[PDB]
Amino acid sequence: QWALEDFEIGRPLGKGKFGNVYLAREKQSKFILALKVLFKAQLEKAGVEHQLRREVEIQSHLRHPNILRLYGYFHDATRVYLILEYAPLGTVYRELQKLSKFDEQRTATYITELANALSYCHSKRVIHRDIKPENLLLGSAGELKIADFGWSVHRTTLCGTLDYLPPEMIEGRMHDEKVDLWSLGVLCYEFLVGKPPFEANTYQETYKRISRVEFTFPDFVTEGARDLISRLLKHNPSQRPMLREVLEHPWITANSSKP
Numbered sequence: 663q664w665a666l667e668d669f670e671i672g673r674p675l676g677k678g679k680f681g682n683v684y685l686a687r688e689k690q691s692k693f694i695l696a697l698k699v700l701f702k703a704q705l706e707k708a709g710v711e712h713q714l715r716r717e718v719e720i721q722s723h724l725r726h727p728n729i730l731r732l733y734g735y736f737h738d739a740t741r742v743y744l745i746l747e748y749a750p751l752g753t754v755y756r757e758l759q760k761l762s763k764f765d766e767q768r769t770a771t772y773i774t775e776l777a778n779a780l781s782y783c784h785s786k787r788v789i790h791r792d793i794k795p796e797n798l799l800l801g802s803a804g805e806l807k808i809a810d811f812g813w814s815v816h817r818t819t820l821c822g823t824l825d826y827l828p829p830e831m832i833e834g835r836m837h838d839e840k841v842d843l844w845s846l847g848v849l850c851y852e853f854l855v856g857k858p859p860f861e862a863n864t865y866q867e868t869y870k871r872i873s874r875v876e877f878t879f880p881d882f883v884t885e886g887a888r889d890l891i892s893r894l895l896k897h898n899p900s901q902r903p904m905l906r907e908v909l910e911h912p913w914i915t916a917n918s919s920k921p
């Protein structure tokens with residue numbers, strides 16, 4: 663159905679992994695959107711071509727205000743095109759770099775939006791969202807948009823991004839939606855501190871620190887934040903909180919801007 667000629671392509675928004683993304687406009691409807699270009703050769707070489715295919719298929723049936731909407735996709739012999747919701751304010755990652763760390767209010771609000779999205783995802787049996795700051799885009803009102811279409815990987819090939827992977831994903835082959843509770847904890851930490859909790863010199867050391875749940879807090883992290891993060895970063899996934907509990911955490915309640 664869709665083809666490149668169905669769109670009026672504008673300026674490049676930026677260069678990402680596997681290709682550029684363009685501000686664009688569907689011809690007939692004049693609807694403004696983002697067009698992500700992905701080169702098949704780079705997808706194959708990076709080992710993520712099958713993940714991307716699965717993700718675009720799953721997410722084509724999903725709709726949530728804090729998930730970057732995927733309107734559709736198409737391909738030729740060379741490239742894959744994603745027709746995406748346009749998120750004007752770019753990645754949370756750039757803001758995190760600019761500011762070094764976020765305050766508790768912006769953080770709790772981000773954690774809220776992420777928790778709502780992940781709750782929706784789980785109801786749809788969609789799990790293990792790679793919600794690292796690079797994959798978090800910003801709507802025109804500063805609302806967070808999960809934009810993970812399966813293009814990061816890390817014997818067995820693991821899906822996602824090392825610093826955010828839970829112990830069960832690195833130690834074993836079985837895991838459920840509780841992995842998304844672990845990620846939420848890493849992100850909350852990262853938001854407040856400026857770096858993820860298990861950051862180490864090498865992959866292997868990161869691999870081991872995650873297994874041991876070996877991390878420390880800086881002194882400035884408040885008690886409520888530490889409490890949430892500590893609950894989220896539990897080794898046994900069965901011991902991790904449910905998303906409802908997160909959304910009703912006193913530190914979240916006391917600090918988030920929205921339900």
Ligand SMILES: O=C(O)[C@]1(Cc2cccc(Nc3nccs3)n2)CC[C@@H](Oc2cccc(Cl)c2F)CC1
Pocket residue numbers: 675676677678679683696698730746747748749750751752753756796797798799809810
């Ligand atoms: O410089 C930046 O901030 C960007 C480009 C950029 C800058 C400003 C706004 C913007 N808005 C957008 N709305 C939808 C897609 S991009 N996009 C670099 C490329 C990056 O590429 C991606 C990253 C993760 C997931 C996805 Cl779908 C990506 F397309 C997006 C941020």
